[model samples]
Target: GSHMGSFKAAGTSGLILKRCSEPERYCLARLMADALRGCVPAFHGVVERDGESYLQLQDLLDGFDGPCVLDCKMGVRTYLEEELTKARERPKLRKDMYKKMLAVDPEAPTEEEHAQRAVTKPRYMQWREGISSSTTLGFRIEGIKKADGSCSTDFKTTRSREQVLRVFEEFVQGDEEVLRRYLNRLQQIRDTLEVSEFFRRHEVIGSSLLFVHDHCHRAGVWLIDFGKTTPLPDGQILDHRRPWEEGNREDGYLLGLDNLIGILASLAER
Candidate 1:
């Protein structure tokens, strides 16, 4: 009686295709689980059964009063910066790996031969572009936003470039260590040939770093966009680590406790 209306037959043969695609759904569910693993304590597990999938992010921070005020905001900046570094590395890593694979393969075909064997040129191009384009777009967006001050979602209005830079300078004031560490890391990344190419291609990595000057308004410097993360070079396979592939879980690279202190110092001054 309760299932007499549109619910009838709607869950039968018509939805078979949807129900059949369970493996892919499960893969995605697993990714979500991994992503939330360390970040959210409440995310106990993710599962797929019957015809649906479930996520268990049940009030991860329920009893918490939130981080101490200084830690809260400084934490955000620290995270953003770290994320940007990784984000800058992603596309270059992928592109380089693909090229490396091609170079090393004994049976690798020439570009023309590969193109000939491709079932659909458009499809191949689309997929190839998707891998790199996603990162490229992310880099551009982050760079422009950081440079022009169009990134503040709170203000909802773009601050002038000068103002944004000034804000960043103020944000990092008196924080010599955070600033030094960030620059050192940048230099380290830049010195590596592969990382240098990645950084050069994705200038936002540098642009966003300007925040250490005065503590930019950009929130969470180390963990900027977790949504666009990819794996590190020589890291786990994409298929194996579905979390990074699915763009849910991001591995935080460098930003750590010391950086947090610098930010805390700046915030406390304010």
Candidate 2:
């Protein structure tokens, strides 16, 4: 959460403001913005405002009308412990917390707050249920917006199973074309950087593979969030080091890529 922030640009209707608190993360994010330009949000350079630095990026959905956007993660298992805590059943704990809240403020919005909380509680419960029942990685249907400008947290209820399947089918088809562009661009990035002799490395942890489709029926993948990415070095060699070792940095990127490709292929086949 401290890693990144997004806000609306002051004068631009189609651009978004991104900022990082830590100078190191800010610089690394700038590097990713440069490396993955065009394939992702177009980075419009950086500036300082109110003594804080910010990165300006073109909002991917700026010109698109009523676009359907989905946020999916790659390294779900990397935070397995935290996810499990979220999935844990704690009805008594929840009740106790609510009791404490009421004790602190007995008149908390005259039942309106209760109703609003009730409305959202079921969604969280369902998420925990799904997480507890499944072994698969965090494949959440995060959010969905219809072309009519309506949003829904529950995709399955609002959209038919067949409709959802078709949406992903179209996304996969479009992603095939995007993947070609990405591969070519990636080679260019690799060429520009002078890395270790043993492996070419770049990190993609906590990155999002965004699926978006506009009113015109155009669909594509957009990469976002590059806070954890590491910079390239001149030459380094691994010597019985761990996957996350400084010298063995490339393994995570390679593993993430492989897992992403495998997941995409599996989804495409279905």
Candidate 3:
């Protein structure tokens, strides 16, 4: 799993209890409170009930009346620097990931890589990014669920600006009001990110723009999943729009946000 833990719809009507412990997630929620008050879910504190710990959080799906949902994973590099370093140190060649990559694009791996029939974690991760809109647009559609509860991961290979825009169009289902509302919220989020010290300080990895909209025309986008959000060095402020080099620590968060905003703008002008 991309995240260290999973979440379930097991709490009260308006909240979700993620299967996690400790206070890191709670810290992220508190950190976002100043810069992203409405851009994020209401971050209630964590709670331990029965024998397990739970990340008590505002369920973004609470009032959606079984809305269509889209999970657009944000950032250029989804994994942390430490994760990459660890992968380099303990390079495990995974044939499973190789097969998945080959299934999608048979020519993805090099001749030597093909002969090996396996790839290192770093190589696989890089290939994964290349196959999706992550490197191109700095974000990629991770999953989509229609109002009927039908789920699809058809966007795994969904790259290019046009294709991403069309997915958004279908997600909104020609509802200009919903699209307009989502655009407004995304704009607000970008503005908030511009001035957010927390955003500047953290190398935002594996975060997501959770989009939810209903037939009632209610639409919203929330910044969610901060498990891999790591803080930078003491005096370093990341220029998130630049392409990431090895030690630059640029996660392309703003790049992704800008591209997403541009995609929506293109949709709205249609």
Backbone clash count for every predicted candidate, in the order shown:
25, 0, 0
lDDT of each: 0.29, 0.45, 0.82
What's model 1's overall lDDT?
0.29
lDDT of 3 at 226: 79
Q: List clashing residue pairs in candidate 2.
A: none
Tens-digit lDDT track for model 3 on 133-197? 99989999999988876889887789899999999988898999999999899988999989887
Error of 3 at 76 (Å): 1.5
Write down the worst ten-residue block by lDDT for model 3. Answer: 1-10
Better model by TM-score: candidate 2 vs candidate 3: 3
For residue 237, give model 2's deviation from the true position in Å: 8.1
Per-residue CA lDDT of candidate 1, range 1-270, in tens?
011111112222212111213333333233344422222223234444465644333321122222101111211111223344454554222344344334434244447545443222322222332332121121111222222233332321212333333443543445556445545543443234122322222212111222222133222122122222322444322221111222322211223223333333444444
The sequence of per-residue lDDT tens digits that candidate 2 reaches over residues 64-120 is 556666664433222212223443554223444344345544453236545543212
Please name the candidate that would achieve the greatest TM-score relative to the true structure: 3
Model 3: per-residue Cα lDDT at residue 35: 78
User: Residue 190's C-alpha lDDT in candidate 2?
Assistant: 35
Q: 1 or 3, which is superior by lDDT? A: 3
Please provide the root mean square deviation of candidate 3 (C-alpha atoms, Å).
Answer: 3.2
